[PDB]
């Protein structure tokens, strides 16, 4: 698989690690819709609004199966550690017009 999941459950925004590469979600948008990180980096999305959101990668892009992350409520977070270079598109399952990508280099 090209990503590791540190926590299968969402966790509190206060529990996000110190060296965290944060993407905020607010106003029905991923605030950094094109993020560039390097191999081995953990990206953490934090939902800043009351409407629940997640990140969903379809099958074949991070692994054989789709990775449909858990719904994050307000001030909850979810992390993915990327282990292989490439461009990984994602969207929000209930809100497919919300789209972003992680370019791992
Ligand atoms: Cu959403």
Swiss-Prot record:
The organism is Paracoccus denitrificans
What cellular component GO annotations does this protein have? periplasmic space
Cofactor descriptive note: Binds 1 copper ion per subunit.
| Part of the whole protein covered | 27 to 131 of 131
What is the name of this protein?
Amicyanin
Predominantly, its location class is periplasm
This protein's record includes keyword Ribosomal protein: no
Query: What is the annotated role of this protein in its UniProt record?
Result: Primary acceptor of electrons from methylamine dehydrogenase. Passes those electrons on either a soluble cytochrome c or to pseudoazurin.
One MF term in the entry's GO annotations: copper ion binding
Q: In which pathway does it act?
A: One-carbon metabolism; methylamine degradation
Domain Plastocyanin-like, chain residue ranges per copy: 1-105
Q: Where in the cell is it found?
A: Periplasm
Keywords in alphabetical order: Copper, Electron transport, Metal-binding, Periplasm, Signal, Transport
Q: Which cofactor does it need?
A: Cu cation
Query: Per its UniProt entry, which superkingdom is the organism in?
Result: Bacteria
The keyword Electron transport is assigned to this record? yes
The UniProt record gives the binding positions of Cu cation as 53, 92, 95, 98
């Amino acid at each position: 698989d090209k990503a590791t999941i540190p926590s299968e459950s969402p966790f509190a925004a206060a529990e996000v690690a110190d060296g965290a590469i944060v993407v905020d979600i607010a106003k029905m948008k991923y605030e950094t819709p094109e993020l560039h990180v390097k191999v081995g980096d953990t990206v953490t999305w934090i939902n800043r609004e009351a409407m629940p959101h997640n990140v969903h990668f379809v099958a074949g892009v991070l692994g054989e199966a789709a990775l449909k992350g858990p719904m994050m409520k307000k001030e909850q977070a979810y992390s993915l550690t990327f282990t292989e270079a490439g461009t990984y598109d994602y969207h929000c399952t209930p809100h497919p017009f919300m789209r972003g990508k992680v370019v791992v280099e």
